[PDB]
């Protein structure tokens, strides 16, 4: 036997980025566990938030900017 | 008094607000706030409930999964 490298496409989600999960026919002892593994892999591909911007394009760089008047912000990853 | 912040993820579709509840006192650093938002985003990523082949058949068991196809589509709730 050999492990299987599956490619997962998230329904409706853009940009179109493949999520790869390695599953073993003799390890995955449950279909629900496969779904959990896929769920974790999707969560892992979430880029960590590195920057924040106001709607008008100013970078939010400190706690003071963050607790001002605006309560809507744009998050950018890497 | 806690602040309810709406985060919009850049370039991500569909357009779904991520809300984070933050307190000016409890938030110790700006990095802490970025981490709490990152965690909030990962949480709102729905748990995968159904899988489908490209052609439209639901994959519902281990045997369907270890067939010949190796590309699938995930659906949440």
């Amino acid at each position: 036997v050999r492990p299987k490298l599956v490619t997962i496409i998230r329904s409706g989600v853009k940009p179109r980025k493949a999520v790869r999960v390695l599953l073993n026919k003799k390890t995955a002892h449950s279909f629900e566990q496969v779904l959990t593994d896929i769920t974790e892999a999707i969560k892992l591909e979430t880029g960590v938030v590195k920057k924040l911007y106001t709607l008008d394009g100013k970078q939010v760089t400190c706690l003071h900017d963050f607790f001002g008047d605006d309560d809507v912000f744009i998050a950018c990853g890497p | 008094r806690p602040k309810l912040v709406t985060i919009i993820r850049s370039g991500v579709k569909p357009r779904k607000a991520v809300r984070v509840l933050l307190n000016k006192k409890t938030a110790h650093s700006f990095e802490q706030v970025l981490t709490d938002i990152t965690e909030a985003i990962k949480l709102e990523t729905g748990v995968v409930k159904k899988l489908y082949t490209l052609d439209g058949k639901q994959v519902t068991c281990l045997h369907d999964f270890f067939g010949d196809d190796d590309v699938f589509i995930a659906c949440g709730p």
Partner: peptide, 6 residues
């Protein structure tokens, strides 16, 4: 262009 989902 192939197209499918859901």
């Amino acid at each position: 262009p192939e197209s499918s989902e859901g």
